[PDB]
Amino acid sequence: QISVRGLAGVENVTELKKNFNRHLHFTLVKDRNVATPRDYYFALAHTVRDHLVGRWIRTQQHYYEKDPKRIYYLSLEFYMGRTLQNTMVNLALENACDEATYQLGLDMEELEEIEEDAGLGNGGLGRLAACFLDSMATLGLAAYGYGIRYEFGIFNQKICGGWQMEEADDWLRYGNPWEKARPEFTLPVHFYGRVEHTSQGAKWVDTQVVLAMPYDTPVPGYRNNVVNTMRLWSAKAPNDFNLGYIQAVLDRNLAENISRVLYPNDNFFEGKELRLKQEYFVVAATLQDIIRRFKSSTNFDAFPDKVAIQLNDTHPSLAIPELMRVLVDLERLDWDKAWEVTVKTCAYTNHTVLPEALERWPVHLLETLLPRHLQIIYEINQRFLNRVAAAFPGDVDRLRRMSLVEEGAVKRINMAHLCIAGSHAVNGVARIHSEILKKTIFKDFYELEPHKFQNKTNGITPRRWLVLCNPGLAEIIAERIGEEYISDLDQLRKLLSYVDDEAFIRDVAKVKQENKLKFAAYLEREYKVHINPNSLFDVQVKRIHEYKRQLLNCLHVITLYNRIKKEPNKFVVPRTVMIGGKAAPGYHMAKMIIKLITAIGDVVNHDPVVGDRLRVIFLENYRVSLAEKVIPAADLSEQISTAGTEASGTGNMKFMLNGALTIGTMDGANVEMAEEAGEENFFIFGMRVEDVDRLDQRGYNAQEYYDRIPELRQIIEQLSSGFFSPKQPDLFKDIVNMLMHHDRFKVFADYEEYVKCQERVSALYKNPREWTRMVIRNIATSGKFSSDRTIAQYAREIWGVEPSRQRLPA
Amino acid sequence: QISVRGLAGVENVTELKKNFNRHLHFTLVKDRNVATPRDYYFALAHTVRDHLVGRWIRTQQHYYEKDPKRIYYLSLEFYMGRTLQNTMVNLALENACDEATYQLGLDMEELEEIEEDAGLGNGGLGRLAACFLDSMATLGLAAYGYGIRYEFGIFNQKICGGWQMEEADDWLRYGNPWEKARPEFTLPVHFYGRVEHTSQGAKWVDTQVVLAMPYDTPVPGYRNNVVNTMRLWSAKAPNDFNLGYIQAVLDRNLAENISRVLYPNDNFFEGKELRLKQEYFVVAATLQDIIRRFKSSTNFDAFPDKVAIQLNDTHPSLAIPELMRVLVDLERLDWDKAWEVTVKTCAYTNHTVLPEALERWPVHLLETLLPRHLQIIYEINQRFLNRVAAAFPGDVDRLRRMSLVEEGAVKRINMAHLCIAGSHAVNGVARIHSEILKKTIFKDFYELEPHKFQNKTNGITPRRWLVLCNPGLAEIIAERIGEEYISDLDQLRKLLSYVDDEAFIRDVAKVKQENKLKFAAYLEREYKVHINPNSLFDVQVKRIHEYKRQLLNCLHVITLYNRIKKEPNKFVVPRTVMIGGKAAPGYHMAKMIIKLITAIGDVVNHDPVVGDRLRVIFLENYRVSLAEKVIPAADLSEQISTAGTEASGTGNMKFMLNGALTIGTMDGANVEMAEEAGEENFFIFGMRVEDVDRLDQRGYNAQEYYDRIPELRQIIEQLSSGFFSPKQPDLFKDIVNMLMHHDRFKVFADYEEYVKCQERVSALYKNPREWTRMVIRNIATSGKFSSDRTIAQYAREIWGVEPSRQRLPA
Numbered sequence A, B: 001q002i003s004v005r006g007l008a009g010v011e012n013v014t015e016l017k018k019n020f021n022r023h024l025h026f027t028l029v030k031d032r033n034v035a036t037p038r039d040y041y042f043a044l045a046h047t048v049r050d051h052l053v054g055r056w057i058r059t060q061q062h063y064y065e066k067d068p069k070r071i072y073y074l075s076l077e078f079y080m081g082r083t084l085q086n087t088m089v090n091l092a093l094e095n096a097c098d099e100a101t102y103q104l105g106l107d108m109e110e111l112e113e114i115e116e117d118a119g120l121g122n123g124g125l126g127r128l129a130a131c132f133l134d135s136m137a138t139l140g141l142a143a144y145g146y147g148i149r150y151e152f153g154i155f156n157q158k159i160c161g162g163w164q165m166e167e168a169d170d171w172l173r174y175g176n177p178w179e180k181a182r183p184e185f186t187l188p189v190h191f192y193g194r195v196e197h198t199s200q201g202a203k204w205v206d207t208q209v210v211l212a213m214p215y216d217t218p219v220p221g222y223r224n225n226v227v228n229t230m231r232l233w234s235a236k237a238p239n240d241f242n243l244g245y246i247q248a249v250l251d252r253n254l255a256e257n258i259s260r261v262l263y264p265n266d267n268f269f270e271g272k273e274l275r276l277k278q279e280y281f282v283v284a285a286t287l288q289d290i291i292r293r294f295k296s297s298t299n300f301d302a303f304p305d306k307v308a309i310q311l312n313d314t315h316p317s318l319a320i321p322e323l324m325r326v327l328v329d330l331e332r333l334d335w336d337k338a339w340e341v342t343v344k345t346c347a348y349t350n351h352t353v354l355p356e357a358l359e360r361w362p363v364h365l366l367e368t369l370l371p372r373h374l375q376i377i378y379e380i381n382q383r384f385l386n387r388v389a390a391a392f393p394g395d396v397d398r399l400r401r402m403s404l405v406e407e408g409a410v411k412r413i414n415m416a417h418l419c420i421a422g423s424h425a426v427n428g429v430a431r432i433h434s435e436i437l438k439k440t441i442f443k444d445f446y447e448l449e450p451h452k453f454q455n456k457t458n459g460i461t462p463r464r465w466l467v468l469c470n471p472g473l474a475e476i477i478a479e480r481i482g483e484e485y486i487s488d489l490d491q492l493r494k495l496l497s498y499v500d501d502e503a504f505i506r507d508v509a510k511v512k513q514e515n516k517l518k519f520a521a522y523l524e525r526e527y528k529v530h531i532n533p534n535s536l537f538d539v540q541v542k543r544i545h546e547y548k549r550q551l552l553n554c555l556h557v558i559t560l561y562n563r564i565k566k567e568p569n570k571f572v573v574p575r576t577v578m579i580g581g582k583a584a585p586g587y588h589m590a591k592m593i594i595k596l597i598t599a600i601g602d603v604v605n606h607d608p609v610v611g612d613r614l615r616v617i618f619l620e621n622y623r624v625s626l627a628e629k630v631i632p633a634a635d636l637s638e639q640i641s642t643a644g645t646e647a648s649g650t651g652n653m654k655f656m657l658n659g660a661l662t663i664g665t666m667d668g669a670n671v672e673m674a675e676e677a678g679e680e681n682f683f684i685f686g687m688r689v690e691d692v693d694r695l696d697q698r699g700y701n702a703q704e705y706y707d708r709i710p711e712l713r714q715i716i717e718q719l720s721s722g723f724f725s726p727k728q729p730d731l732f733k734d735i736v737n738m739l740m741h742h743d744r745f746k747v748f749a750d751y752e753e754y755v756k757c758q759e760r761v762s763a764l765y766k767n768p769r770e771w772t773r774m775v776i777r778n779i780a781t782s783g784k785f786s787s788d789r790t791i792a793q794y795a796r797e798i799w800g801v802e803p804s805r806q807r808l809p810a
């Protein structure tokens, strides 16, 4: 149908059809008379998968022959989403498969909706890992993603009575056609035990053993015939485990629980033993695999020349002491040489500055679970502090501030300090974030080793986030500038010469309208909810958290509602406000915010006077597959975190690339986005980081804003009086109390400027032509935010490898 | 190579080779450079599996079109063993696959050894179910085997320090290529809750739900293109299960534990809650599936005409009250009509008379777990006893003897009584066993309803137990009488006309020698143990149990050893005594018997004076695959259970068909085997059932035998003095105490006659020609013991269906 979706050759369509029927028969063991839609989905999945194998086998054989430096990206999260369409896009098989299934009397889009999301992540951090794998494959890097194969990913969110209900994400129920179990590479992981000091070296003995079984999933590059690997470990008990009889067998579950479920927290540290076990589990299995592959290429001096380990935050920080343990205890290298190798091999990426999100493990936990690692950590700390003492003689407070060991009620290990000490590079994920790291939380470290600190602004893959989810936009763009931009997003700048092109302006606006119509229909299909496609689609989708300030958005919504009730027959630009995102199960305030949102909708959506001028919808179960649907349909992107709290943000980039204008604070990547597009083409408002600091020094007093802003006072009084909760008048008392007495994120402080800015948005929307021209200016300057640019910088500035755009023989 | 293995056509060999390479590439994602033997095994398995699908799909379509009466065999055990070779045999692909793999540079036999046994059974009862499935498919019956897909089957037995060690049988570790998950047919099973009595009928409410997910495995008939199904249920927790968050997800294990492991008991009842849950789990899921299929053919009067349910012992006895529950509570049929349908639908097979093996569930357990079923059972009992009271007025003791409810310390439900009352047919598994049922334990029931009692002597499938495990013997036989006997075993009688044929006599003897050489080599390969292939192979393989009397065998072995030590330079026929079998983990005496056996071997195998004249080997981890190796190599089959205890026995039939002579008591099927072959061609000894009864009436006094038999006294003194356990003089004190004071199985009573009989065996072995002629007479008369004969009788006399030998279009 459309150009960017590839060719539908006669030979290929014929081949696809026969292989489809072959799998339906031999693989699914079914006939066209009893086959269900799910059966057809699997037949198609296996058919597409077949096209990957040849390339997958030769890519790996290629790396063996050339032996390039290997990149290992360690993460406890890989938010992959669905794999079928992405695979077709990267293999240029979309139109062929669409035609083939069409001829078989099937609708491919219907089949794609059957695939379960691989939701092995919470949000931004996990999705970044997924985008990175795509880019590393597209740039021809010998990269491997290593993680855990959770039996249950992020929970499926259900809304009952306006409240969030959690249900298990049994994503493997019907099977996973993309993965390939590799039991032959199963490795042992040790826990507990004790340390024994012998004549020659220490020994970790009397440990409990848990097996790590790997499952490999192919990661295809964009049309370059490269297929890398994502290896996820699954926990298995040894067969002699606990070996009355029956109980011993049933207790195998204890060991296998390690890979059972993903901790559902976004930007929040929960110091539970099971989580620590998961972190060591992935690190121990991965490092053995890395060393095994290295030897199969004694001379560990060349280890850093053949290996690069990237730590996605501190979750896999134990890789540092584990590498030391192996090199020192097992390989018998002297400490100094081992440390040199470790530092040159490891690099650390920080993803937040919120104190509650930093990992600080209790010493008593490490002491019992990983006794040898604790000893190695104390030794690392000892030698590191000796270096600090030599550089800053007499500065005793600096010593206690930089220590990896934190004193107090209970001693803890600051994992971030461990990562900085044992890594040759430390980076933030957006310019402002990286600067904050050097100026605040990591200031002492920056002063000791300035060369270690870098910035690597985040990005998103234009394959999944443009071509896959918005083919209509990808097509009108390709029509003007070709298809080269898909793997060289900077070329979108050429669109700047079409900002005055009446034809282009019309096409851009038409694509958006079509996306909105499609999404508007979807809402009624799977969720039975009516919305006016002519209204401005105002959306804020991301995990629910106080720092992201969904509450500020709520305040604006209520303001709009009160204004309409005050002057009913006054014209206002129609809006459909959409808010979606999951709240961590144990995050009470976050769950209350969800209830507030649905409560507001209950009132606003049923008020006769409002009509179709204002609608408030809460998008249930926001996940990757849902993002691919709502983002292309958005007009306004809400990125309103308090300045200095959102390290980078990536959802913001997805909206910019898909034709939505942005209203937001100068926080995270928003700053660079506005810089690229021009501040006049962005809706910036609120306090800057400096303004927040000034307020804190003076003391934030929410009462002041309440006393001086009549409209704000009214909203708070409505909340307190039960206006939004008739049967439960004090239902939102906790929210009001927090806002009024202990709001760490200063919601009230940005209220006035936010509302004013929103009026400017409605003003521009009333002028279709000018709204679209500003949109074009945003799309045209979103090139910098491609994860291909991000990965190329990591490759050259951190890993020491050169990216390649060369195709491999298919 | 050999005739009976089929043709190796050029076209087929070429096709097999290409499909083998296809699966290695696309299915296993590997190349010939990194493929391991396990990889090659799977490539072959998938290749053979492909040949089954077409036939499997059309067989099921066939049953849908013709709608014949369906046979449902319910069992908690299906001891299948390996599937690859069996599939090739039934599809006549063995030589083709052998040639194809040969050309690819691979040894098929080596690949077959890689497959894990599907050990979902304990012994005889579970293997009978497996043989039955094979025969039902070969006889063209629309049969379905229903059971549980245990994650862990019978434990793998390891021998350490002469003691049995148990280790988990993780048979699904590398995957199961034969099964096909059918999540689309997942069904709910209810537990706990309470009964609510409403205006119209009772309702079972507030129950906990566990999902039953089916996995289908194909069951090919012998060269008739019929492929039936074995459906095994797997337990799955619902997604809203227990829905802090993490714990709720981890607790899903509680529900899924139902299908986690097989209870490892042979002829022993263990009243644990988990076992009861397994029994109801299989019954509830299966019955819903049966009824669903029935409706997809309201008129339950025709239910018995379209459905037959065979209960393999009482394990699935809850099918009776569950069927009543569904018909009465859900379908709204009146009790009397529902009962009529239930009785006409169900049939029960008893497999033992040992009191400790009978199921008697505590009322308090059923009361809590299945409240509605308990009520239905009380009602059934009430109406049944009313019938008894009317037939035998005033006989109050008969009423208490026949009640389904047993009074006493704790009230229990006698499941056997439940089965007899709710079944239209009850059968024993050997003529003598069925007679004992009518004369003793079920006497009262037989007097009330004589027409219900039948006999169906057991059998074994000649496919796995002759053609598959002993191709050499199958070939020399086919050379003389053709291949028709493989599916019409009675034709072996034609071999009687070759008993004087010098050529045949030589071939029979040659095949046995080759089998012994192969097995003798195997022992050194995987177990490093030397044995003299020229000796008589004396073997007893079966589960370890006191009633099977492995101890009597031990006494004979020690006798032989003492005699040699007494007259060292006297000639004796060399023997290799092999004993193997697993002991239930909680069966202490059984574990002590294993230790005694290895202890005897430790002494006998290292005595210089004995030389290679006597060897005692304990065959580790006896299972189906091992049986296929040792049985064809045996000369003497030990079937020495105390008369009246072995219901039938089936191992005895396997040995008879494979050229071994039998030494045994007139117990179980041994009686019919001797009757078929002629008592002069069997080595019978010991007390008959009548003799055992006389002894019990008089009182068994073991001391008497000890006082009057010098050789026996010596053995007991050696055991007591520590002769076989130097470091632990009283190690076998429990064994001696049991033998001397509380031996329920009268080991001593048959000692003298057993030893005398064994001398007659050694005498015949010294005459090769006559030994072989007697062997021929046994093989020639083993036809009656084919499970095809057994199934044909069940079909005509119980299920009301006619077996068919007609091929289906392939």
Ligand SMILES: COC(=O)C(=O)N[C@@H]1O[C@H](CO)[C@@H](O)[C@H](O)[C@H]1O
Pocket (backbone or CB within 6 Å): A123, A124, A125, A126, A128, A265, A266, A267, A268, A313, A351, A352, A357, A429, A458, A646, A647, A648, A649, A650, A668
């Ligand atoms: C440990 O931090 C987190 O939980 C987390 O998800 N952080 C997130 O990581 C993303 C990728 O760098 C950033 O864009 C987000 O701003 C940051 O909050």
Ligand SMILES: COC(=O)C(=O)N[C@@H]1O[C@H](CO)[C@@H](O)[C@H](O)[C@H]1O
Pocket (backbone or CB within 6 Å): B123, B124, B125, B126, B128, B265, B266, B267, B268, B313, B351, B352, B357, B429, B458, B646, B647, B648, B649, B650, B668
């Ligand atoms: C519940 O009984 C058992 O545990 C069991 O395995 N019984 C066995 O069943 C076999 C098949 O009929 C018979 O041949 C054996 O003699 C009987 O002991």
Ligand SMILES: *Cc1c(COP(=O)(O)O)cnc(C)c1O
Pocket (backbone or CB within 6 Å): A122, A123, A124, A127, A541, A542, A543, A622, A623, A624, A627, A648, A649, A650, A651, A652, A654
């Ligand atoms: C892109 C993405 C995120 C990150 O969004 P931010 O607004 O940067 O927090 C979270 N969840 C999903 C499903 C995403 O696709």
Ligand SMILES: *Cc1c(COP(=O)(O)O)cnc(C)c1O
Pocket (backbone or CB within 6 Å): B122, B123, B124, B127, B541, B542, B543, B622, B623, B624, B627, B648, B649, B650, B651, B652, B654
């Ligand atoms: C045939 C068989 C049995 C039954 O043997 P009996 O001697 O009748 O108890 C038990 N186990 C296995 C593995 C078998 O093949």
